[PDB]
Amino acid sequence: EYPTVSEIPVGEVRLYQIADGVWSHIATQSFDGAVYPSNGLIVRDGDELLLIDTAWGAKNTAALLAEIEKQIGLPVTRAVSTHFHDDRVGGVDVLRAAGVATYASPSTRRLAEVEGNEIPTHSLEGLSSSGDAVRFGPVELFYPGAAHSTDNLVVYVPSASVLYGGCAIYELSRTSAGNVADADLAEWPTSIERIQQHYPEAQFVIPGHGLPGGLDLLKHTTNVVKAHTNR
Ligand SMILES: [Zn+2]
Ligand SMILES: [Zn+2]
Ligand SMILES: [Zn+2]
């Protein structure tokens, strides 16, 4: 069964195997006196690994690298951050010092700089217009349009039919909108429909926080966003 907060204390990281050569990584962080979980992805690319997102902070990200070497034993050579917030880029400096090449879209890199957050080194081309997709090793990267943030990317693993939605997709147990200070509420439902149109065959869907499910998570997120819009 999928790990939850009660089973992970801050500073530790769990790995969960989704399919052959595809794992999620789960970590926790405190904020405002509550404890929140957070997901990223690991995908095998021959004899190397691609990482999607940090584990939300420098200490957690060092623990993530140690857990990968203990449990998988292959080198992490590249990492992609899916938007500019600290649960996605916090820990980029640890990755860089370990020899991992770090990547994000130019939009993400600019917004991280304005915020004073850590800045991935390399710029991903071909993702500036809504509906754009590019291949990056064993995954496809897709820019659906503005949603949780103006820069948010989603990631698809074709060999395993795994769709990683990041923070643009909510878990089923979340019934109210989360942090929306940087969101585009007007465009978020349209961006979700672009994901459904491009990846209708997805079998596993991973939100940025909480439990995986199926494609139902997309309509669920639209329902929650529209209710918040009508507040
Ligand atoms: Zn975010
Ligand atoms: Zn998030
Ligand atoms: Zn729902």
Residue numbers in the entry: 32 to 262
Give the article text.
The combined biophysical analyses reveal 3-oxoisoindoline-4-carboxylate derivatives as a new class of MBL inhibitor, which do not, at least with the analysed compounds, strongly chelate the active site zinc ions.
Compound 35 (IC50 = 7.7 μM), which contains a 3-fluoro-4-hydroxyphenyl motif at its R1 position, was more potent against VIM-2 than compounds 16 and 17. As observed by crystallography, 35 has the same overall binding mode as 30; compared with 30, 35 is positioned to make additional hydrogen-bonding interactions with Asp119 (3.03 Å), as well as halogen-bonding interactions with Asn233 (3.75 Å).
